[PDB]
Design a protein around this ligand. Structure first.
Ligand SMILES: [Cu+2]
Ligand SMILES: [Cu+2]
Lengths: 130, 119, 130
């Protein structure tokens, strides 16, 4: 196809698309005699998957595995759901440690007077002084 | 022949780039599909396969086989010429004469200058 | 004090220490006969504070300016606490986004049979199909 048309359909740009391509994460679209990256429908929907996978959170490598499954007709939906729930687990732990963060942040905040003073307890307790 | 270049263009499983937009493309007397091409490239391959073995028939330009050749041609004549790659196909004939012609000169280079020879 | 002393007291890696130095997060450590950075307890407290701003989640510049506040006794505990609450706002948005996208992950995990099937709904969902 033409390239901008495909990237405005899918929202990407030729630069990001070419990054993904150099990562070997989709079908390589052929060129033309002139050199335009010859896209297709296969490239279109492979790109759509490679886009939405990192949105889900499957990384470059893992989204590439989703793609090579998208090429594979044998693909194990079983595996796919293991990958799914594994990433669910990482996102859970991410949430939990961020909750620990915000908890300690608010513990430090609410103790601070916020009375435009230089004697901020947060500052001095973040350093191992006194 | 464009039969062979049509094996080339689909050699790597696919092409929709402009190499096909220069190929057969009947004008009314636009990326082409595989169906449409395989249809258009079937009758000219039919003329190919039938037209060669008949050239043996009692003369290279024998009237029956030569009118079969005329069918191959005239069938190609409604269709258009094909892109810059065809220059190679012409050059692939030039390189014949480039040799052949030259070899006669080369033979003449051994023959006509040294001793007397009629003309 | 060399980089090793303040390092193994605070707990940084030497490369990251020299980095935070070159970033200007910390003060200039004075140099030796041969260019060895003669650190102090000031620098040690600075690096302790700089960690405890970093591991909290503040980026390089925010942690650095806080370390600079530690040396400005004109500082304001109010500024410290509003900084804390802006970072809290970031963490809230981050964690609720995590939860939401993990919720759709859960939805699609429910959608899949997960049974070694070629035709998983998910590969058909993230792919721009139908
Ligand atoms: Cu305070
Ligand atoms: Cu499935």
């Amino acid at each position: 196809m033409n390239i901008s048309d495909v990237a405005k359909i899918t929202g990407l740009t030729s630069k990001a698309i070419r990054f993904y391509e150099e990562k070997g994460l989709v079908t390589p679209p052929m060129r033309s005699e002139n050199g335009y990256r010859t896209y297709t429908q296969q490239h279109l929907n492979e790109l759509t998957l490679l886009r939405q996978a990192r949105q889900v959170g499957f990384n470059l490598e893992e989204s590439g595995e989703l793609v090579n499954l998208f090429n594979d007709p044998q693909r194990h939906s079983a595996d796919v759901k293991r990958r799914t729930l594994e990433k669910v687990a990482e996102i859970e732990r991410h949430i939990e440690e961020l909750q620990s963060m915000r908890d300690q942040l608010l513990a430090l905040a609410n103790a601070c007077p916020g009375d435009d003073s230089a004697d901020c307890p947060i500052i001095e307790n973040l350093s191992g002084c006194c | 022949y464009l039969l062979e270049q049509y094996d080339r263009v689909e050699a790597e499983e696919a092409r929709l780039s402009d190499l096909i937009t220069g190929f057969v493309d009947p004008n009314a007397e636009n990326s082409i599909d595989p169906e449409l091409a395989r249809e258009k490239f079937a009758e000219l391959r039919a003329q190919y396969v039938v037209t060669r073995d008949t050239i043996k028939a009692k003369g290279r330009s024998h009237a029956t086989a030569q009118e079969e050749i005329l069918k191959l041609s005239e069938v190609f004549k409604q269709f258009r010429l094909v892109p810059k790659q065809f220059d190679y196909l012409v050059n692939s004939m030039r390189v014949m004469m480039d040799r052949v012609r030259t070899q006669e000169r080369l033979i003449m280079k051994l023959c006509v200058e040294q001793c007397k020879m009629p003309k």
